[PDB]
Ligand binder design. Structure first.
Ligand code: MG
Ligand code: MG
Ligand code: MG
Ligand code: MG
Ligand code: MG
Ligand code: MG
Ligand code: MG
Ligand code: MG
Ligand code: MG
Ligand code: MG
Ligand code: MG
Ligand code: MG
Ligand code: MG
Ligand code: MG
Ligand code: MG
Ligand code: MG
Ligand code: MG
Ligand code: MG
Ligand code: MG
Ligand code: MG
Lengths: 97, 332, 123
RNA sequence: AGCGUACCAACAACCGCAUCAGGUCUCCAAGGUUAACAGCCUCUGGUUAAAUAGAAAAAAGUAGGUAAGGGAAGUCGGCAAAAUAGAUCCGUAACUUCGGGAAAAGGAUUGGCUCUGAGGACAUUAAUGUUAACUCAGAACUGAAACGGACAAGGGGA
RNA sequence: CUUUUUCGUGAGCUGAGCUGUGAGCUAGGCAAUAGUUCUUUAACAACAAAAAAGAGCACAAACUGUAGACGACUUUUUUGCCUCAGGGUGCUGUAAACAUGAAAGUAAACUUUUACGAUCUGUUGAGGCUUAUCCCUAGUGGUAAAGUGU
């Protein structure tokens, strides 16, 4: 059944091993995989503004942390939408339903 | 195995250049929680080698001893050791009488307690410990008094004793001849590359011999090393387990910030002079010498003057966390 | 196709790798050839459709015959060093399937006398 | 009057057996830094494609980078690599066909910021006004003593 | 096969003792035949169909990195683990913003007032970062699919 979640992901933990030309696509792939595994949905869609945010500093160094919102809809009966949340500080944020 | 540190000691060697001076030495720390004795096994001699008569178990065993018999305990009904411990004592005494009558070697089965360490594993380790001493009757009366108790480490070894160590070296995978065997590296002009052996053999034994070094797997080997000396046996009930008579700061053995890649040591432990094969967390087997040493080093007794407990992350500068706050004063 | 189970390669296995999923078949080498699986699935669907017409119950069908034959190959080229040209062939095949429905002294008077005497002697 | 006029011109339309990293003649030519149509970055116009993609990442290879103390002991042999490089101001031997050698060899300086001085034209009277354009000298402050900061760019001698 | 009788030997019977089992003692009555030999079908161990007496785990999956080319190996699956956060321990070297604070000097209104100014100082041992193979924490939110063999 439908549900909504707010989580933060730190990407430097996930892009630590790849080379310069692969740092941003690796982050994108990791975000998709994480969301799909946390929602039990094979169909995962990424909003274009989030993709724009991930690439804002070039291919070589994406941001170290990102806050996203995950919602599961009813449409392979279900699927997940992933959006971007703008924050000015990550200090206190834990994850919530 | 937990990690390493260094100490300060005064030398007592008449004739040496270091006869009356303070020196620094490296040491290794082994976490040594007590084991539990759970069974008995007896052997007799034959022309085909030693031979088992039978095995006798204690009346109750723990769940971390039973986990070692399963590839996946979380999905099982856990019926191991649930019928056999319910036998009358009469059968056990008849078996023990037979072992007293026909056997010549006794060994005791013991297991470790990984829940008292910071390890992720929950299965215990099982091993057999031979019991030397008097006659077989005395050996049997000795073992039975221990059949469901704890062995602390100071029941087995003594301070200033010499010990042997058995473990498995660190793994590295597939390595070349230059690293695996240490052969002379070949000139820069070589066409197909320079990290190899130039000649594999003469023409005519028309085969390669088994003494020629090749590429292959390096590390994760089994080793036995002699003559490692004991410097101190710590106790988990002791507040100043890393302080000396010359340094009365009240200290434990664990450095500021935890042993890197291991965790905090809060059981009793051993301090060994030197180094030991294996990674952090690697299980280390300890044994007495084949025959006792009587040399001057094995008999000399050691008095320590300083154990170091500064951080091994980065370049540590304080011995305790209170010094650090006292030095800087109030922060923002 | 989804790499949940494998196909053990027992005959044409020169250089094929080793895998974790082959232990199910008591073997060490396996692979996941998807194209072959799709081609076989089309034919099995045809077999089931032809069994629907002649009124057989599908739950009892057993594949009693599976035969694969190699057909005439197609032709292309590849180019090599020092001005040479070499073949670049293909390898097509045939397939056929059948499913089927499953459930679940001489008298010789002299010889007769010998037999009688033998049987008498053992009692 | 008659004949030609589409399209490619290599990036897959030409020659090389091919949709081959090769070969193949002319014209136009922006901004910044500079001696510079060099090197590096950019606007107009063009493109984001190459006989494949994903994951893992050890031996060994190929194209690169760094290395304490020593400094050719290596090798047939300093092969390969390293060191030097732009401008300005000083100083330059033997020998010589008197022209050279010569950038011989050697030495010092170089950023930023705030100032001072020197180089023209025009029109009313030695005075008065109106106006440029890039160069070259000197001084005080300033910084983890750095400044041809990337690019570009001689090793020398008997 | 009958008759007259003895001794050992044990099931039910407690070296009472019937009887089971073997070995004998008297006196008798009653068989064998396939036409001259063709291996004298004779042992040991199995199996099948009937009748009676007895009746669990491993692989896979998601984690782990003490392991690693791939296989293989070390681990966990609800006091565990993954995640993010707080705390510790370290690395770098004092953030952005304001200040009618400083600054070699400069020009422009009538002792001050306005303007420009490399750089410096105060708030500031500050700000950032720290496991992906660092340490601690019944802190937050999760912990999915039902497949294969025996
Ligand atoms: Mg060569
Ligand atoms: Mg260290
Ligand atoms: Mg503290
Ligand atoms: Mg070719
Ligand atoms: Mg050719
Ligand atoms: Mg006959
Ligand atoms: Mg035309
Ligand atoms: Mg035209
Ligand atoms: Mg031709
Ligand atoms: Mg071409
Ligand atoms: Mg091409
Ligand atoms: Mg390489
Ligand atoms: Mg360096
Ligand atoms: Mg060096
Ligand atoms: Mg030499
Ligand atoms: Mg030599
Ligand atoms: Mg050279
Ligand atoms: Mg000269
Ligand atoms: Mg500031
Ligand atoms: Mg982790």
């Amino acid at each position: 059944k439908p549900v909504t979640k707010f989580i933060t992901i730190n990407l430097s933990k996930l892009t630590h091993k790849v080379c310069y030309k692969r740092k941003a696509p690796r982050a994108i792939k990791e975000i998709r995989s994480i969301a799909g595994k946390l929602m039990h949905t094979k169909d995962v869609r990424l909003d274009v503004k989030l993709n724009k945010f991930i690439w804002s500093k070039g291919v070589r160094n994406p941001p170290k942390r990102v806050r996203v919102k995950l919602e599961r809809k009813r449409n392979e009966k279900m699927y997940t939408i992933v959006e971007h949340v703008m924050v000015d500080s990550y200090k206190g944020l834990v994850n919530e339903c | 195995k937990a990690g390493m540190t260094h100490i300060v000691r005064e030398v007592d060697k008449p004739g040496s250049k270091l006869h009356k001076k303070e020196i620094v030495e490296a040491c290794t720390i082994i976490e040594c929680a007590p084991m539990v004795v759970v069974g008995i096994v007896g052997y007799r001699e034959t022309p085909k080698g030693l031979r088992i008569l039978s095995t006798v178990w204690a009346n109750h065993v723990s769940d971390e001893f039973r986990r070692r018999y399963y590839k996946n305990w979380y999905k099982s009904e856990k019926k191991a050791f649930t019928k056999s411990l319910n036998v009358p004592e009469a059968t056990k005494n008849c078996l023990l009488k037979r072992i007293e009558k026909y056997c010549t070697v006794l060994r005791a089965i013991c297991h470790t307690q990984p829940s008292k360490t910071p390890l992720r594993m929950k299965k215990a380790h099982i091993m057999e410990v031979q019991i030397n001493g008097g006659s077989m009757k005395e050996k049997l009366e000795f073992v039975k008094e221990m059949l469901e108790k704890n062995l602390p480490v100071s029941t087995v070894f003594n301070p200033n004793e010499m010990i042997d160590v058995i473990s498995v070296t660190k793994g590295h995978g597939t390595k070349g001849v230059v690293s695996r065997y240490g052969v002379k590296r070949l000139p820069r002009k070589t066409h197909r590359g320079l990290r190899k052996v130039a000649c594999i053999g003469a023409w005519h034994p028309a085969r390669v011999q088994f003494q020629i070094p090749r590429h292959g797997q390096k590390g994760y080997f089994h080793r036995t090393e002699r003559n490692k000396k004991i410097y101190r046996i710590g106790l988990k009930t002791d507040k100043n387990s890393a302080s000396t008579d010359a340094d009365i700061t009240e200290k434990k053995i664990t450095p500021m910030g935890g042993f890197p890649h291991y965790g905090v040591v809060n059981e009793d432990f051993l301090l060994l002079k030197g180094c030991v094969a294996g990674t952090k967390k690697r299980p280390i087997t300890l044994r007495k010498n084949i025959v006792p040493q009587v040399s001057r080093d094995a008999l000399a007794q050691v008095s320590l003057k300083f154990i170091d407990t500064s951080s091994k992350i980065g370049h540590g500068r304080f011995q305790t966390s209170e010094e650090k706050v006292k030095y800087y004063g109030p922060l923002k | 196709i989804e790499k949940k189970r494998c196909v053990p390669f027992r005959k044409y296995n020169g250089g094929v790798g080793r895998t974790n999923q082959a232990k199910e078949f008591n073997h060490t080498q396996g692979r996941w050839p998807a194209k072959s699986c799709k081609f076989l699935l089309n034919i099995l669907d045809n077999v089931q459709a032809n069994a629907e017409s002649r009124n057989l119950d599908v739950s009892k069908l057993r594949l009693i015959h599976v035969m694969v034959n190699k057909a005439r190959p197609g032709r292309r080229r590849t180019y090599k060093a020092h001005g040479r040209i070499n073949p670049f062939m293909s390898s097509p095949c045939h397939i056929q399937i059948i499913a089927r429905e499953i459930n679940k002294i001489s008298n010789q008077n002299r010889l007769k006398n010998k037999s009688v005497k033998k049987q008498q002697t053992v009692q």
